[PDB]
């Protein structure tokens, strides 16, 4: 209609989204203050009301957006994110997990999707990921196989670190980040299993060498984009 | 013959290797569950049978592959790997080391050699290695010489870390990864040998500087490949 | 006038700034010795006088520079820095914070602004920063949102690390540097909150992946400068 | 003469240096065994004799080399290194420091100078250094200025880490490597000086950011070499 076009030109208004962005940074500050228990004694009700004010506004104005765009809205990854972020924010407290209330803070990520400069940089990062998928596949296979080996080789006498497949996953990722791999994992390990370095020195080497290539690769593919 | 060509067109069948790949991921999951002792009480016999089912299949079908290809098979590094991986998997339990049973998990790496996308990424990594061989030679020489020096300079009062050439190798590699080099090695060292930094600050610097070049080099040689 | 031009050709003299540079390295050494309490017992008065000698000289000769250049001086970032560095150096001891006396050492950074080769390398580094501003914005938003989440999720039972928004900021930056993230933060955390890895493994991953891109980006933009 | 040319064509003989290289790896192994006290009880005299055999040979054959080349020898950095390495190896035990005997192991680095492939890779690394000299100057100035500040700000209550200019240098380098910067330096520091992060978070940032550029720079200058 021209009703649909009236709503649409309010919805795609620059001011409309600048008001939204403004609502985001305001509520962002809000949530910064609600970590403080001092501030929460004084203005607990103030901030808890503002939070509801803004979330209804977001639901009001995602209703409007869906009107304007219908199917195309749900095929847009930025819009989808604002949907599922305001969704998890909608569910009320004391229903399901209580952890859902920390997830309310995800609303702030609307800033990324509402700002164009932020949307540009995110798309640039996400762009890189497809080229990485082979290396990620390889590395996951490598982690999985060594997790099993380490679980089997060390999980009985070292149950906190290797007693479980998932425990070995975590410990192995720790090692890969190089965080206390020697004086916190392998040197203790070796106190019982003196040849444990035979398992972990190669693990280090391979994991490192692969990550280097992961990065080198990303660089090359960015230069191949400039050279066209 | 045309028998040889009949076997060969079953062996090079797409479906044939898709069945193999499928057998790999199945058994991969299997081995994930056999880390669990719960699952092993219930279905111990089930998984231990599946494992034998699949390994015979792999030996059956490496026999077929060798038939089809004979000498050319044993000059292919992917095929060779499947040979020596199914080989170490063949030897029965309680013969030789018992560690051979964790090595059975290496079978999962067949995924890398059976999948073409995985084979591509591995070849890409292995490609990089030849250019690195000079730097690796240098660094090994450097490690060896400092290992000796550190063994001699510190192995008596610090026998757990430097008492042996191999111990100093391990400790020096630890340092290179920067893992607790100061508050776990050098600062304790210095409690007795106050000028120990004179040995380790340069060691750090050289090792770091070389590794940077190792990487920078890899990058350049990848760009020299794009620029042709 | 030609008075103004007489002062100006003394002020822009090569020798003039070589004398200044010389005054900087001398006083640099001075301040190296005044860390020593031995040296301060013997020559305390000597160095404390030299320091005043030189600072008056610097104020004398920033007066001259402002004469020669007036407004253009205050629109130059190198000159501005020498202004505010000699300014904070001017304020006398025991007025305001006492920390202002360590800030006197900032005078040595005049070397960067007085030497041309040093000025070149600093401008090269500062040049890089504008391209980084999107990624920095993103990362700050990401840090802020996870700081809040971590403050809320863990600040009661872990008040030293997550009890405050700013405490969580510091702890999260620690994690990003990978410094004791597992055996000093997450593994203790998990002793009470077993699913804490669900918060921190992703945090690691995202922070790392972004930093890689931060760097990769810098590289590309430097090559885009060579290719013109 | 043609005597000089007779000696010269023995000295520049391929076999001559292959014999030398062979002497190096032999003695390299020797010195590996002399770390072992077992081996030193049995063959102490054997290895200690071999060591003298080879060093005289090296002095014999650096005499020959100097004959062949005279001044040009002493303007070659590879030859110079073999001079000063065999020199420090010449001085006998129990004269001066005893540390001179560990320096005997430096002889093994003759491998780098005697092998051409090794000489190539070393020259490639050393090549990189000139471009780095500005950044190194800057960073040294930065380290020095913060060392002083940290010595003054923290050396009284933290004398093991900051009580001395050189102590602060070491601690600051530790921080730069990120080794236990938080749970081993700054968090303890903060127990007394709660605003200590104001000094160290910026220090981290600047040091990191500079090192990135140090590396990025090296990459660019290597590509500028390929693009000619
Ligand atoms: C479009 C441009 C937007 C520009 C925004 C830039 C934002 C950059 C991040 C700013 C970080 C703020 C500094 C900070 O984290 O402060 C730490 C303090 C210390 O804790 P504090 O609560 O004082 O503890 C005292 C004891 N207590 C609880 C009993 C009162 O904790 C507090 O006191 C709470 C202070 C909350 C300040 C929140 C400021 C953030 C601005 C909004 C961020 C953008 C939202 C999308
Ligand atoms: C953009 C494309 C994708 C990006 C890359 C990420 C994809 C790969 C991620 C790993 C996939 C597998 C996930 C997995 O195995 O998780 C299982 C475990 C189960 O945890 P659980 O046993 O409940 O907890 C263990 C800790 N505990 C008991 C001491 C409290 O959960 C853990 O606790 C382990 C934590 C995960 C370790 C990280 C493994 C990384 C795999 C290699 C990735 C290379 C990155 C380049
Ligand atoms: C071609 C596409 C293939 C796609 C596959 C992608 C695979 C990515 C890695 C997946 C990682 C699986 C998650 C994981 O590690 O779980 C940790 C759990 C926790 O230990 P759990 O055994 O529950 O401990 C409970 C106590 N207990 C032992 C008495 C029962 O440990 C377990 O409960 C055992 C769970 C085993 C799950 C195995 C799933 C891996 C899929 C196959 C991998 C490919 C093989 C080549
Ligand atoms: C793709 C081309 C090749 C890839 C690069 C790898 C080649 C170089 C690897 C090192 C070669 C030398 C191997 C070696 O020296 O190993 C001897 C020692 C003997 O161990 P052992 O004395 O039985 O155990 C010591 C630990 N303990 C007693 C406290 C339980 O074994 C150890 O425990 C030491 C562990 C090895 C330390 C790593 C040394 C790296 C050398 C520099 C490589 C630079 C990489 C870019
Ligand atoms: C344009 C070209 C300029 C070239 C300059 C290159 C500068 C490079 C950095 C040099 C670093 C100097 C070495 C250093 O940090 O020495 C540590 C010593 C050890 O502490 P020390 O004070 O001996 O402790 C003994 C006990 N005590 C206090 C009771 C006496 O601490 C001391 O004894 C104090 C020694 C102060 C030496 C200062 C030398 C720096 C030169 C000026 C730097 C340039 C200024 C812009
Ligand atoms: C050239 C363009 C800009 C360069 C990038 C830098 C800009 C971003 C810096 C962070 C901005 C926000 C600053 C902020 O939130 O500071 C608040 C807190 C308040 O400290 P406070 O609560 O007084 O002290 C906590 C420690 N305590 C209690 C145990 C003694 O202060 C702290 O103690 C936290 C220390 C800061 C943590 C670093 C956060 C980094 C944000 C992400 C930056 C990514 C870098 C690529
Ligand atoms: C041109 C091509 C040259 C190719 C050479 C490649 C060299 C690569 C590095 C090889 C590293 C050798 C492995 C290693 O570090 O072994 C650690 C062992 C363990 O200590 P060990 O002495 O067995 O301790 C037992 C207790 N004890 C002392 C009472 C007997 O310590 C020992 O038992 C001593 C073993 C010494 C073996 C030395 C082998 C190095 C070859 C020469 C290196 C080139 C010299 C330039
Ligand atoms: C290829 C071109 C050149 C390569 C770059 C290297 C040039 C710069 C190196 C540093 C120059 C200044 C040297 C210096 O200040 O050393 C003084 C101190 C004095 O040590 P001292 O007070 O006897 O021992 C302290 C430890 N203690 C008491 C607890 C046992 O000695 C130490 O103990 C401190 C150890 C040195 C810390 C490293 C400082 C690095 C400066 C920034 C370099 C950036 C690298 C990219
Ligand atoms: C575009 C990008 C790479 C191709 C490209 O042109 N970019 C980089 C190549 C140069 C992406 C797009 C499609 C990707 C693969 C497939 O989805 C599945 C594949 C099977 C593995 O088991 C698991 C994931 C694998 C490795 C994926 C990674 C691979 O990387 C591909 C080709
Ligand atoms: C191809 C690659 C480098 C040449 C190239 O074109 N790529 C990079 C050069 C640019 C590879 C192929 C052959 C390699 C060397 C030799 O096998 C032996 C040699 C002697 C050392 O003691 C130990 C290994 C050394 C340093 C090897 C490394 C070197 O790197 C070479 C040339
Ligand atoms: C060649 C290289 C850089 C020039 C170049 O072409 N390469 C990189 C430039 C792009 C080298 C060669 C000569 C170098 C400088 C001088 O010796 C002294 C100078 C004064 C500082 O107080 C201390 C060292 C400085 C910064 C040196 C670093 C600088 O980096 C130069 C120019
Ligand atoms: C790139 C290729 C991949 C390389 C991967 C190869 C990994 C090599 C594995 C080396 C493992 C070293 O770890 C090794 O673990 C076994 C566990 O059975 C120990 O074995 C020891 O403990 C077990 C209990 O678990 C006892 O039953 C056994 O009698 C005893 O010797 C070894 O003493 C230890 O040194
Ligand atoms: C890039 C070039 C390569 C640089 C490599 C040069 C390495 C320099 C070596 C510095 C070593 C410092 O380590 C130094 O070790 C010797 C060991 O003899 C110590 O010496 C001390 O211990 C030994 C026992 O072992 C005693 O016999 C001796 O009387 C005592 O002084 C020094 O107090 C310590 O400071
Ligand atoms: C890229 C996407 C971003 C991913 C970010 C998602 C973060 C996921 C959060 C996982 C957090 C895990 O941390 C989780 O913290 C909560 C705190 O309520 C704990 O919950 C526990 O402690 C709290 C007290 O604080 C009790 O009230 C509660 O009954 C108890 O279960 C969980 O046992 C712990 O595992
Ligand atoms: C990029 C720009 C460079 C940024 C560099 C700026 C560095 C900023 C310095 C912040 C230092 C924080 O460290 C600060 O040290 C002083 C030391 O006087 C402490 O001060 C405290 O200790 C001293 C003793 O030494 C007492 O005399 C004083 O009364 C007390 O307040 C502060 O409580 C602490 O927080
Ligand atoms: Ca660490």
HEC profile of A32-86: HHCCCHHHHHHHHHHHHHHHHHHHHHHHHHHHHHHHHHCHHHHCCHHHHHHHHHH
Which residues are CB-neighbours of C107 under 8 A, at least 6 positions away?
A: C24, C27, C55, C58, C85, C86, C89
Judge contact between D73 and D61, C-beta under 8 A. Answer: no
Contacts of B164 in chain D (CB under 8 A): 35
CA A89 to chain centre: 16
**C223 contacts D227? CB cut-off 8 A:** no
* Helix/strand/coil for D34: coil
Of B105, B108, B118, the CB nearest to A137: B118
> What's the token pair of residue D46?
């054997």
DSSP classification of residue D182:
I
Alpha-helical runs (H) found in A70-196: 71-74, 77-90, 100-103, 110-114, 116-128, 133-154, 159-162, 165-176, 187-190
Judge contact between A79 and C123, C-beta under 8 A. Answer: no
Alpha-carbon distance of B62 to B76, in angstroms, equals: 13
CB of D201 within 8 Å of any CB in chain C? yes
Judge contact between D179 and B182, C-beta under 8 A. Answer: yes
Q: Rg of the Cα trace of chain D?
A: 25
Would you say how long chain C is, in residues? Answer: 228
> What's the token pair of residue D203?
């220090």
CB of B173 within 8 Å of any CB in chain A? yes
Closest CA to C108 of C48, C30, C168: C30
CA of B166 to the centre of ligand 7 (A): 7
Alpha-carbon distance of A103 to B154, in angstroms, equals: 53
Alpha-carbon distance of B105 to B34, in angstroms, equals: 11
Would you say how long chain D is, in residues? Answer: 228
CA atoms B122, B124, B130, B134: torsion sign? negative
What are the domain boundaries of chain B? 1-116, 117-228
Of D35, D109, D226, the CB nearest to B151: D35
Closest CA to D48 of D62, D30, D32: D30
Q: Which helix (H) or strand (E) holds D227?
A: none
Which residues are CB-neighbours of A223 under 8 A, at least 6 positions away?
A: B223, B226, C220, C223
Closest CA to C188 of B80, D119, A184: A184
Closest CA to A197 of C7, B174, C163: B174
Alpha-carbon distance of C129 to C134, in angstroms, equals: 10
Judge contact between B85 and A145, C-beta under 8 A. Answer: no
| Other CB atoms within 10 A of residue C183 CB | 15
Alpha-carbon distance of A168 to A147, in angstroms, equals: 5
CA atoms D153, C100, C174, B214: torsion sign? negative
Q: Which chains touch A (3 or more CB pairs under 8 A)?
A: B, C
Domain A1-116 homologous superfamily, CATH:
Voltage-gated potassium channels. Chain C (1.20.120.350)
Alpha-carbon distance of D61 to D55, in angstroms, equals: 10
Judge contact between A112 and A119, C-beta under 8 A. Answer: yes
Judge contact between D112 and D198, C-beta under 8 A. Answer: no
Contacts of A178 in chain C (CB under 8 A): 178
Alpha-carbon distance of A105 to B32, in angstroms, equals: 36
CA of B191 to the centre of ligand 13 (A): 13
| Other CB atoms within 10 A of residue D107 CB | 23
Q: Which chains touch D (3 or more CB pairs under 8 A)?
A: B, C
Buried b (16+ CB within 10 A) or exposed e, C164-174: bbebbbbbbbb
CA of D130 to the centre of ligand 11 (A): 6
Would you say the CB of residue A115 lies under 6 angstroms from ligand 1? Answer: no
Give the resolution to one decimal, in Å: 2.8
Which DSSP string do the residues of chain B spell out, in sequence order? Answer: --HHHHHHHHHT-HHHHHHHHHHHHHHHHHHHHTT-HHHHHHHHHHHHHHHHHHHHHHHHHHHHHHHHHTHHHHT-HHHHHHHHHHHHHHSPTTSS-STHHHHGGGGGGHHHHH-HHHHHHHHHHHHHGGGGHHHHHHHHHHHHHHHHHHHHHHTTT-HHHHSSHHHHHHHHHHHHTTTTIIIIIIHHHHTT-TTTHHHHHHHHHHHHHHHHHHHHHHHHHHHHHH--
Residue minimizing CA distance to atom 17 of ligand 10: B133
Task: Tell me the CA distances in angstroms from D205 to C104, C177, D175, D176, D189, one per residue in order.
Answer: 22, 10, 11, 9, 18
Q: Which helix (H) or strand (E) holds D98?
A: none
What is the CATH number assigned to the segment(s) D117-228?
1.10.287.70
Cβ neighbourhood burial of C69 (10 Å; 0-12, 13-18, 19+): middle
Alpha-carbon distance of D63 to D70, in angstroms, equals: 10
Closest CA to A78 of A31, A125, A111, A127: A111
Would you say how long chain A is, in residues? Answer: 228
Domains C1-116 and C117-228 share a fold: no
DSSP classification of residue A129:
G
Alpha-carbon distance of A78 to D226, in angstroms, equals: 42
* Helix/strand/coil for D36: coil
Task: Tell me the CA distances in angstroms from A185 to A158, A178, A199, B159, B192, one per residue in order.
Answer: 10, 10, 12, 19, 26
Alpha-carbon distance of C17 to C4, in angstroms, equals: 18
Q: What is the largest CA-CA distance in chain B?
A: 79
Would you say the CB of residue C112 lies under 6 angstroms from ligand 5? Answer: no
| Other CB atoms within 10 A of residue B193 CB | 16
Alpha-carbon distance of A75 to A77, in angstroms, equals: 6
CA angle C219, C222, C223 (to 5 degrees): 90
Residue minimizing CA distance to atom 29 of ligand 2: A167
Q: Which helix (H) or strand (E) holds D86?
A: helix D77-90
Cβ neighbourhood burial of A100 (10 Å; 0-12, 13-18, 19+): middle
Q: Which helix (H) or strand (E) holds C194?
A: none
């Amino acid at each position: 209609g021209s009703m649909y076009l009236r709503i649409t030109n309010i919805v795609e208004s620059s001011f409309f989204t600048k008001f939204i962005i403004y609502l985001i940074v305001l509520n962002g500050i809000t949530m910064g203050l609600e970590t403080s228990k001092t501030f929460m004694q004084s203005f607990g009700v103030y901030t808890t009301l503002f939070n509801q004010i803004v979330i209804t506004i977001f639901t009001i104005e995602i209703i409007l957006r869906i009107y304007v765009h219908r199917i195309s809205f749900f095929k847009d990854p930025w819009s989808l994110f604002d949907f599922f972020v305001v969704a998890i924010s909608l569910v009320p407290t004391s229903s399901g997990f209580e952890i859902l209330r920390v997830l309310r803070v995800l609303r702030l990520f609307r800033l990324v999707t509402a700002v164009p400069q932020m949307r540009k940089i995110v798309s640039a990062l996400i762009s890189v990921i497809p080229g990485m998928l082979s290396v990620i596949a390889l590395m996951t296979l490598f982690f999985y196989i060594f997790a099993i080996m380490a679980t089997q080789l060390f999980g009985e006498r070292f149950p906190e670190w290797f007693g479980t497949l998932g425990e070995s996953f975590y410990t192995l990722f720790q090692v890969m980040t190089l965080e206390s791999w020697s004086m916190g994992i392998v040197r203790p390990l070796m106190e019982v299993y003196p040849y444990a370095w035979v398992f972990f020195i190669p693990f280090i080497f391979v994991v490192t060498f692969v990550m280097i290539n992961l990065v080198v690769a990303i660089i090359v593919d960015a230069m191949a984009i400039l050279n066209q």
